[PDB]
Amino acid sequence: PFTPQPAPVTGNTYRTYVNDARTLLNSYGYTMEGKVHIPIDRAMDLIVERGLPVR
Amino acid sequence: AQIFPRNANLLSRLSIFALVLLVVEGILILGVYFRSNYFRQVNVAIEQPVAFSH
Incomplete structure (x- = not known):
């Protein structure tokens, strides 16, 4: 029983x-209906800086 | 030459040789079975009740 060789996946994938979304989550930019983008791992620093209401 | 044909001298030695080969082949078959992909169910696509495709 040789190791199976599955057929290659069809063209359409989630990749x-x-x-595209992770590239959007970086490198800033300007959105369609708004003003400016903010890269991820940078807006999180703004969140911990300005903070959220507690209790 | 009393109770045996002429060829038996060759056959007897060949038989001993063939016996040794058969013995070695026996151990070989035994080890191949206990390490095969059918005995260990290796590279066998087990059918699932719902046919889930990863």
Whole structure:
């Protein structure tokens, strides 16, 4: 029983969605209806700086 | 030459040789079975009740 060789996946995959979104989550930019983008791992620093209401 | 044909001298030695080969082949078959992909169910696609595709 040789190791199976599954057929290659069809063209449509999730990879293009994830690559586009993570690229959007960096490198700033200007959105369509708004003013400016903020990269991820940087807006989180703004959140801990300004803080959220507690209790 | 009393109770045996002429060829038996060759056959007897060949038989001993064949016996040793058969013995070695026996141990070989035994080890191959206990390490095969059918005995250990290796590279066998087990059918699932719902046919889930990872």
